[PDB]
Amino acid sequence: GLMQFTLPVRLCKEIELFHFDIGPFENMWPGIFVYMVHRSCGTSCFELEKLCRFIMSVKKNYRRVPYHNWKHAVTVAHCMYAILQNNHTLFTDLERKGLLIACLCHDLDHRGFSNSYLQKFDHPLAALYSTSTMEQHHFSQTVSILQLEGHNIFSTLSSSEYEQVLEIIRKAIIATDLALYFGNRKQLEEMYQTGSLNLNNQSHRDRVIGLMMTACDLCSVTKLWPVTKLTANDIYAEFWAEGDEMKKLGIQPIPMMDRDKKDEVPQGQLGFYNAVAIPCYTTLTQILPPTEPLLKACRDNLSQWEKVIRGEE
Ligand SMILES: O=c1ccn(-c2cccc(OC(F)(F)F)c2)nc1-c1ccnn1-c1ccnc2ccccc12
């Protein structure tokens, strides 16, 4: 109760910035997450012993894959922390509780394969859930862990408050299905432009949280260039493995996933920044002005990828 968490000076200052990198020391990541919960939510909202037990079981249920791993989980939670800390008064007690937990759990039990590969393999999860296949599985893993003995971090909520926070978490996790993002950002764009966007309309709040979840999930494109460039290597390691598994099924993979088309990656990143990342952080900055540093850092990285194409690096 009087047991605060403190980081070394450089981490204490840098963790407040959007472009923070959590570093290569795995054993510090739980303490970084508890620090962010205490400052973002309060020291009183979770029982420390239960929270620590929950974090360690979540960690155990992430796999040893190049990108969709425990480090990505904590990185996405830190970006949500930065957004919540820069938009202090906009979010309820329950949303702050649920959104950091949702980010930590959003890729639980990921094996580095897209919803597409699961459908073509005819994976059992694809029969259980036809759409947002991996995202419904991630939410299912979250409920499993929340139901282990001594793991109910929401124990002091009433049943109706418990049901609300699990519904925040479910929608937040489903929203990380990038297939759903395109329509979501389009609708938010229209609502914003015609001035109909209303943060008191729960169905409008849901869309904005959805867009926050996309922004946090993509946040590797908003780091300083050296971090962004090295993360791209881990992203494409997974893509190329899926490409190999497509060829085993007797299917030519899309060029993004083909390791023979490695030369096409720089122009591939241009496309992703122009089609996905720039619009995402552009629409998010319109709705939440203090997230502008995410758009700025994203543009800086787009400019770095153009230098790669032009042989300036
Ligand atoms: O660098 C990239 C290049 C291509 N794609 C990508 C991923 C899925 C679909 C896609 O096609 C389309 F846009 F048409 F939808 C493109 N994503 C990234 C990327 C940047 C940061 N995260 N991230 C992600 C990498 C891998 N999986 C992710 C899943 C969800 C969100 C983000 C993901």
Ligand SMILES: [Cl-]
């Ligand atoms: Cl605060």
Ligand SMILES: [Mg+2]
């Ligand atoms: Mg995911």
Ligand SMILES: [Zn+2]
């Ligand atoms: Zn993710």
